[PDB]
Amino acid sequence: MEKPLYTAEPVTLEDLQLLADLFYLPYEHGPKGAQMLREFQWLRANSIEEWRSRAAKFEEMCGLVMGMFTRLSNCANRTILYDMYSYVWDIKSIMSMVKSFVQWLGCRGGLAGEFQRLLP
């Protein structure tokens, strides 16, 4: 058996729909992202069998944010990706930490990041 060739899976409509909700409006969050913040707050607030299943689908929800980047990172037209890489790379990373945090709950940003961490 030889090594499977690297293949690019294309950006789906769901990928885009996820992205749109991740970076929505000034005075709003996209439902798909607003839900993802709801679920992470609740999952953090617990220690039933429900948590084990909700924390699972949240890790799937996280891998979706991660996969969305991979597929955007692999498409023929780079121009789209590069004009957003800053914003999309970061969400992918925080989401990657948030996935791992929840895995362990079952068993940065520079100086400006730090000052924004002190105000309420």
Partner: protein, 302 residues
């Protein structure tokens, strides 16, 4: 009826390039939008160094650009923001402003805009002597340029008090807006940003209040998708907060979008879906419009 619907490239930061601007027109044409207002806050020869005449190559590019706007059935509006260091009473200044726009007319541009947004509410000792209030001085030179240019069909004017917040005592009682509405020629259009700079919502009564004092339907400068104020924030959401019931009460909607050009697809597409829905004065769903935009976009990725 005439309605100016399109994009205003009026953000702070690295301005777009000819090939992006060209693709913007293709997109604008495809989505049945008509206008395009050139307002890049950076372009030295627009805000700070406005007086400066364009270079030989700069000229050729702008020409090629204005020509591409026509090819793509797009209304090209050229804006100039003197406001900073301009002396409203020195006729040399007024003449230099006149000379600047003459050069623009040479390139093929027919539609202009005099912008007075984001400037100190104070006139110098010379202008203080010559003109009554700060609105009087702006109106004087705006009308003079509107007339010097042979009263164009499309002539936009952005006031300094361009939103609700910025009005003192308030929109219905501001003596600045009063002078603008009264002494500004009805031919000259007025830019508005709604009740705030980045309006969350633009209620019909809010437009009715300003239309009343500016004594005309306003052209909305929409900062809803503007992102210059936080290069850490992207806006891939839909054109929400503006009722379709606004359309017969406005002369147009020019959306100031994200600095990042490629990120504006959804914001422009959804604006078009919004406008088209009720041109003829729940027809629009932001959540719905968004799926259309996202569907169409998905094709450009490949």
């Amino acid at each position: 009826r005439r309605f100016l619907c399109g994009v205003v490239e009026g953000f702070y930061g690295r301005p777009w390039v000819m090939e992006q601007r060209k693709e913007l027109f293709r997109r604008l044409q495809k989505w049945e939008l008509n206008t395009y207002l050139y307002a890049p806050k950076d372009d030295y020869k627009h805000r700070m160094f406005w007086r400066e005449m364009y270079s030989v190559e700069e000229a050729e590019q702008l020409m090629t650009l204005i020509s591409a706007a026509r090819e793509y059935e797009i209304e090209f509006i050229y804006a100039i923001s003197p406001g900073l260091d301009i002396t409203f009473s020195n006729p040399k200044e007024v003449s230099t402003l006149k000379r600047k726009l003459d050069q623009v007319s040479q390139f093929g541009c027919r539609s202009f805009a005099l912008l007075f947004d984001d400037i100190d509410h104070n006139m110098c000792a010379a202008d203080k002597e010559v003109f009554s209030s700060f609105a009087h001085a702006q109106v004087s030179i705006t009308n003079e340029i509107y007339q010097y240019l042979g009263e164009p069909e499309t002539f936009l004017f952005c006031p300094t008090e361009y939103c609700g917040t910025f009005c003192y005592p308030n929109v219905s009682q501001s003596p600045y807006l009063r002078t603008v509405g009264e002494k500004l020629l009805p031919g000259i259009e007025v830019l508005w940003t709604g009740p705030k700079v980045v309006s969350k919502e633009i209620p019909v009564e809010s437009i009715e209040e300003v239309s009343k004092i500016i004594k005309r339907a306003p052209v909305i400068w929409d900062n809803i998708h503007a992102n210059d104020y936080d290069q850490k924030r992207l806006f891939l959401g839909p054109y929400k907060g503006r009722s379709t019931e606004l359309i017969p009460r406005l002369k147009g909607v020019l959306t100031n979008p994200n600095c990042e050009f490629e990120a504006n697809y959804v914001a422009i597409h959804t604006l078009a879906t919004w406008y088209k829905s009720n041109m003829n004065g729940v027809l629009y769903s932001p959540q719905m419009a968004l799926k259309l935009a996202l569907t169409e976009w998905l094709q450009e990725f490949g």
